[PDB]
């Protein structure tokens, strides 16, 4: 439940930044994790994503795209090991795929990408997350981004 809630919150937040409204982006026991993931995704996208190969050039999702194709491109993030920055990059990449889907009139793919992300998180990332301090350690590492909060009037 918590991992699905994190996926749906992040995707709702990323869609909101492009004027799109999806459910699941309101609190709950994972509120601090949702906030840290949202801020880390923004900070990654603003400053650090530019250093890396743009995964959106390799995967343009249509209703015929298979999970296996998404899995192979997402695997590039983790080939040299899982870490928190690569996990944030995975959420950011899923968010960009959802924005592209709505932009292209394929909004039915948002729920499919959310399911694909929850499956990938479960199969490939959760053992690392839970044996490397859990989401609690990610929150401790990231803290809060006061400059971004001030910029957004938060």
Ligand X SMILES: O=C(NS(=O)(=O)c1ccc(N[C@H](CCN2CCOCC2)CSc2ccccc2)c(S(=O)(=O)C(F)(F)F)c1)c1csc(N2CCc3cccc(C(=O)Nc4nc5ccccc5s4)c3C2)n1
d(CA 76, CA 74): 5
Positions in 78-117 near ligand X (CB under 6 A) = 83-86, 88-89, 92-93, 96
Q: Residue from 48, 100, 111, 118 that binds ligand X (CB under 6 A)?
A: 48
- The answer to whether 10 contacts ligand X (rule: CB under 6 A) is no
- Count each helix (H run) and each strand (E run) in the chain, helices first: 8, 0
Q: Residue from 15, 61, 74, 77 that binds ligand X (CB under 6 A)?
A: 77
Give how far Cα 39 sits from Cα of 6, 115, 123, Å: 13, 22, 25
- The answer to whether 133 contacts ligand X (rule: CB under 6 A) is no
Contact 111, 9 (CB under 8 A): no
Contact 40, 89 (CB under 8 A): no
- The answer to whether 71 contacts ligand X (rule: CB under 6 A) is no
Q: Which stretch binds ligand X (CB under 6 A): 7-15, 99-107, 116-124, 142-150?
A: 142-150
Nearest distance, CB of residue 78 and ligand X, angstroms: 8
Closest among 131, 9, 135 to 81, alpha carbons compared: 131
Q: Which stretch binds ligand X (CB under 6 A): 14-22, 27-35, 106-114, 135-143?
A: 135-143
d(CA 69, CA 141): 32
Q: How many residues does the chain have?
A: 154
Closest among 152, 90, 153 to 125, alpha carbons compared: 90
Query: 22 vs 97, which CB is nearer to ligand X?
Result: 97
Number of residues that bind ligand X (CB under 6 A): 26
Residue numbers of the site for ligand X (CB under 6 A)? 40, 43-44, 48-49, 52-56, 76-77, 83-86, 88-89, 92-93, 96, 138, 141-143, 145
């Amino acid at each position: 439940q918590s991992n699905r809630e994190l996926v749906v919150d992040f995707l709702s937040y990323k869609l909101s930044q492009k004027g799109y409204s999806a459910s699941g982006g309101g609190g709950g026991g994972m509120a601090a994790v949702k906030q840290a993931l949202r801020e880390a995704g923004d900070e990654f996208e603003l400053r650090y994503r530019r250093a890396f190969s743009d995964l959106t050039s390799q995967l343009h999702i249509t209703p015929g795209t298979a999970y296996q194709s998404f899995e192979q491109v997402v695997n590039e993030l983790f080939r040299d090991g899982v870490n928190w920055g690569r996990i944030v990059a995975f959420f950011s990449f899923g968010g960009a795929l959802c924005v592209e889907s709505v932009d292209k009139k394929m909004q039915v793919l948002v729920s499919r990408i959310a399911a694909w992300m929850a499956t990938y998180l479960n199969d490939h990332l959760e053992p690392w997350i839970q044996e490397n301090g859990g989401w609690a350690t990610f929150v401790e590492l990231y803290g809060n981004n006061a400059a971004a909060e001030s910029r957004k009037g938060q």
